[PDB]
Design a binder for this molecule. Structure first.
Ligand SMILES: Nc1nc2c([nH]c(=O)n2[C@H]2C[C@H](O)[C@@H](COP(=O)(O)OP(=O)(O)OP(=O)(O)O)O2)c(=O)[nH]1
Ligand code: NA
Ligand code: NA
Length: 129
């Protein structure tokens, strides 16, 4: 099975809300809630990837973020490594720049069942911040 490196951004505002998008019906992990992000490309670092992905997907430039969690997940047909970046400062206002659903969700109200299963320990970790 193919093995991908994925960089995602946990976009947290000052009211402890997270900017969460929903994946398309024909995507892998279809219809799931997600942190915006995507594939790290050849020639780019994980730090560069999360910046580029958040610019493409939601129209913000992260600054002074940090690695919140790195983990491996074996899906039924693919293995990925997920780089979860905590993004607490950024330029711009996040929106559905690719036409995807996107909105602010209270951290305490997040339900891990709504996300890909790889996100479960990260969501649990965020809720103890
Ligand atoms: N973006 C994102 N992906 C996640 C999360 N949790 C999780 O297991 N994934 C998985 C789903 C996918 O298998 C993979 C992300 O791939 P993607 O479809 O977002 O990649 P991409 O946008 O770069 O794809 P492409 O259209 O550029 O080719 O990581 C998450 O919180 N955010
Ligand atoms: Na991508
Ligand atoms: Na993506």
């Amino acid at each position: 099975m193919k093995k991908l490196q994925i960089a995602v951004g946990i976009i947290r505002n000052e009211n402890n809300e997270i900017f969460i998008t929903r994946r398309a019906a024909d995507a892998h992990m279809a219809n799931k809630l997600e942190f915006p992000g995507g594939k790290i490309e050849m020639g780019e670092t994980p730090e560069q990837a999360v910046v580029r992905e958040l610019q493409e997907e939601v129209g913000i430039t992260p600054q002074h973020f940090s690695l919140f969690e790195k983990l491996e997940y074996e899906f039924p047909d693919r293995h990925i490594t997920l780089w979860f970046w905590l993004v607490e400062r950024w330029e711009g206002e996040p929106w559905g720049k690719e036409g995807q659903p996107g909105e602010w969700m209270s951290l305490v109200g997040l339900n891990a069942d709504d996300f890909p299963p790889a996100n479960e320990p990260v969501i649990a970790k965020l809720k103890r911040l």
